[model samples]
Target: ELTLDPDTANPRLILSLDLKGVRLGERAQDLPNHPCRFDTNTRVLASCGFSSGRHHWEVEVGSKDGWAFGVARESVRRKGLTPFTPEEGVWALQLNGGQYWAVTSPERSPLSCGHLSRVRVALDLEVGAVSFYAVEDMRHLYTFRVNFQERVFPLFSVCSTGTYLRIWPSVGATLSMLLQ
Candidate 1:
């Protein structure tokens, strides 16, 4: 789970985990796939640090499944640094099925575990101030206007694959960022 200052209005990412039937063991040891279970929650807050002009953030959470993983979700507001004016902001969610889906331009896409066959993803961005887009079609689906000055606002992300999930921001500038 992540939090943003409602006053400054930065981006935040949150993650929660509920493992009910998984096995845990040391990296070098292996354990039977027993029905293990537990609940985990995480919150992150992004803020503009005095040392850095750009926003800095961190996440904290609870876990019971003996697994190690990174942040699997993200959230952002269009203020402070820059607004998503070039074509629109693009983000992608990669599922366990190896299929990648996206929401883009100006839409709010509701994510469900059933959509990807038991895998679920949730996304919520401030309206008008934020936009949603899909990677494949480059289509806009929703838009909303939100208070940008808030600083304690928060956001979230999650995964159940027992693997590391990564976030790639400014996906539209992949080629340019890479080439440069």
Candidate 2:
């Protein structure tokens, strides 16, 4: 299970007591200043990283109005302005302003409509592609082909109070990707 590390979460983000989820809190917490904590975004990094593998995982966003999820290089910049794109070491998707996007650096494509309550991500580092899907129907959401260059960690971000993200480790996603 790739639980998020509190040390890597932004001060505005609050991790669940179970360590398997995160959400934007109502008030900023006086958390310890860690060098890895993101300064500009409400993001968090998973504790374990995958350098190469056909890894897959699913997340329950539960109607979150603003959020981003994907994989990021272990060396992703933490203290400065960071852009969420493959060129900058992050291959991510976003649900913002009631629309979804497939990130491609300077340009992001609008996503097709579907059940967005849950999202499944498959990271095929060996073949160089990260694809997203709607969990309920396993419908293709988007896919970005990239030559990932380094060990990458699962990344996530959330905003809007009361909205949370829950990760599923044993969600059969890995098996689905393998059988697909």
**Which has the greatest lDDT?**
2
Off by over 4 Å in 1: 1-40, 45-128, 152-156, 162-164, 170-180
lDDT per residue, candidate 1, 24-141, as tens digits?
Answer: 2122222222111011121122222122122223222223211112111123333233222212222323222232223333432343422221222123323214333333343443
| Candidate number achieving the greatest TM-score relative to the actual structure | 2
For candidate 1, the TM-score is 0.27
Write down the lDDT that model 1 would get.
0.25
Q: Report the error of model 1 at residue 25, Å.
A: 12
In order, what lDDT does every prediction score?
0.25, 0.77
Error of 1 at 94 (Å): 12
